[PDB]
PDB file of N, CA and C in Angstrom:
ATOM      1  N   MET M   1     127.526  89.085 154.386  1.00 33.67           N
ATOM      2  CA  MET M   1     127.647  90.002 155.576  1.00 33.67           C
ATOM      3  C   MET M   1     128.900  90.868 155.470  1.00 33.67           C
ATOM      4  N   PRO M   2     128.719  92.163 155.489  1.00 33.09           N
ATOM      5  CA  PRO M   2     129.834  93.111 155.420  1.00 33.09           C
ATOM      6  C   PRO M   2     130.660  93.121 156.708  1.00 33.09           C
ATOM      7  N   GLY M   3     131.857  93.635 156.690  1.00 33.57           N
ATOM      8  CA  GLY M   3     132.654  93.671 157.947  1.00 33.57           C
ATOM      9  C   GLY M   3     133.577  92.466 157.998  1.00 33.57           C
ATOM     10  N   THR M   4     133.174  91.397 157.333  1.00 33.12           N
ATOM     11  CA  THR M   4     133.959  90.155 157.379  1.00 33.12           C
ATOM     12  C   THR M   4     134.437  89.784 155.945  1.00 33.12           C
ATOM     13  N   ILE M   5     135.112  90.690 155.319  1.00 34.02           N
ATOM     14  CA  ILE M   5     135.561  90.370 153.919  1.00 34.02           C
ATOM     15  C   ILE M   5     136.839  89.501 153.970  1.00 34.02           C
ATOM     16  N   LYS M   6     136.782  88.463 154.765  1.00 37.40           N
ATOM     17  CA  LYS M   6     137.948  87.525 154.849  1.00 37.40           C
ATOM     18  C   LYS M   6     137.498  86.127 155.211  1.00 37.40           C
ATOM     19  N   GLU M   7     136.356  85.782 154.683  1.00 34.08           N
ATOM     20  CA  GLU M   7     135.807  84.428 154.955  1.00 34.08           C
ATOM     21  C   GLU M   7     134.611  84.163 154.020  1.00 34.08           C
ATOM     22  N   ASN M   8     134.876  83.963 152.760  1.00 32.77           N
ATOM     23  CA  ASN M   8     133.785  83.683 151.808  1.00 32.77           C
ATOM     24  C   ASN M   8     133.395  82.199 151.856  1.00 32.77           C
ATOM     25  N   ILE M   9     133.212  81.690 153.062  1.00 32.19           N
ATOM     26  CA  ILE M   9     132.848  80.266 153.210  1.00 32.19           C
ATOM     27  C   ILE M   9     131.320  80.157 153.512  1.00 32.19           C
ATOM     28  N   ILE M  10     130.691  81.310 153.543  1.00 31.66           N
ATOM     29  CA  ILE M  10     129.199  81.309 153.821  1.00 31.66           C
ATOM     30  C   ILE M  10     128.390  80.749 152.663  1.00 31.66           C
ATOM     31  N   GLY M  11     128.864  79.663 152.074  1.00 30.88           N
ATOM     32  CA  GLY M  11     128.133  79.071 150.934  1.00 30.88           C
ATOM     33  C   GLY M  11     127.896  80.127 149.852  1.00 30.88           C
ATOM     34  N   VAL M  12     128.854  80.420 149.050  1.00 31.81           N
ATOM     35  CA  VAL M  12     128.621  81.419 147.953  1.00 31.81           C
ATOM     36  C   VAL M  12     128.158  80.647 146.701  1.00 31.81           C
ATOM     37  N   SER M  13     129.057  79.844 146.161  1.00 31.89           N
ATOM     38  CA  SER M  13     128.650  79.084 144.930  1.00 31.89           C
ATOM     39  C   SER M  13     127.720  77.978 145.350  1.00 31.89           C
ATOM     40  N   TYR M  14     126.474  78.066 145.063  1.00 34.56           N
ATOM     41  CA  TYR M  14     125.506  76.968 145.439  1.00 34.56           C
ATOM     42  C   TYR M  14     125.487  75.909 144.365  1.00 34.56           C
ATOM     43  N   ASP M  15     125.365  76.325 143.123  1.00 33.35           N
ATOM     44  CA  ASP M  15     125.317  75.329 142.007  1.00 33.35           C
ATOM     45  C   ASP M  15     126.311  75.681 140.932  1.00 33.35           C
ATOM     46  N   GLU M  16     127.588  75.684 141.267  1.00 33.48           N
ATOM     47  CA  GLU M  16     128.607  76.030 140.203  1.00 33.48           C
ATOM     48  C   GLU M  16     129.958  75.400 140.618  1.00 33.48           C
ATOM     49  N   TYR M  17     129.913  74.428 141.461  1.00 29.53           N
ATOM     50  CA  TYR M  17     131.239  73.762 141.915  1.00 29.53           C
ATOM     51  C   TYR M  17     130.940  72.800 143.047  1.00 29.53           C
ATOM     52  N   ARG M  18     129.847  72.110 142.985  1.00 31.92           N
ATOM     53  CA  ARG M  18     129.522  71.114 144.075  1.00 31.92           C
ATOM     54  C   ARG M  18     130.102  69.767 143.765  1.00 31.92           C
ATOM     55  N   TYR M  19     131.334  69.693 143.458  1.00 34.00           N
ATOM     56  CA  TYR M  19     131.966  68.407 143.096  1.00 34.00           C
ATOM     57  C   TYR M  19     131.078  67.613 142.102  1.00 34.00           C
ATOM     58  N   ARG M  20     130.396  68.325 141.277  1.00 33.74           N
ATOM     59  CA  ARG M  20     129.480  67.661 140.302  1.00 33.74           C
ATOM     60  C   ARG M  20     130.129  67.772 138.925  1.00 33.74           C
ATOM     61  N   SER M  21     131.396  67.661 138.856  1.00 38.35           N
ATOM     62  CA  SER M  21     132.098  67.741 137.503  1.00 38.35           C
ATOM     63  C   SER M  21     132.571  66.356 137.090  1.00 38.35           C
ATOM     64  N   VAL M  22     131.832  65.354 137.433  1.00 38.13           N
ATOM     65  CA  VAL M  22     132.215  63.964 137.076  1.00 38.13           C
ATOM     66  C   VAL M  22     131.514  63.578 135.804  1.00 38.13           C
ATOM     67  N   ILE M  23     130.718  64.460 135.271  1.00 39.42           N
ATOM     68  CA  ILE M  23     130.001  64.169 133.965  1.00 39.42           C
ATOM     69  C   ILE M  23     130.349  65.193 132.936  1.00 39.42           C
ATOM     70  N   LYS M  24     131.576  65.543 132.826  1.00 39.61           N
ATOM     71  CA  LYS M  24     131.967  66.568 131.831  1.00 39.61           C
ATOM     72  C   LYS M  24     131.410  66.180 130.454  1.00 39.61           C
ATOM     73  N   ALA M  25     131.368  67.175 129.580  1.00 35.44           N
ATOM     74  CA  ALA M  25     130.805  66.862 128.221  1.00 35.44           C
ATOM     75  C   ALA M  25     131.879  67.042 127.172  1.00 35.44           C
TER      76      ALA M  25
END
């Protein structure tokens, strides 16, 4: 949503940082 460029908490990264880095390779 434009007009609010100060709150990228609207779920941006869905599958790229969900605390799922416990199985590094």
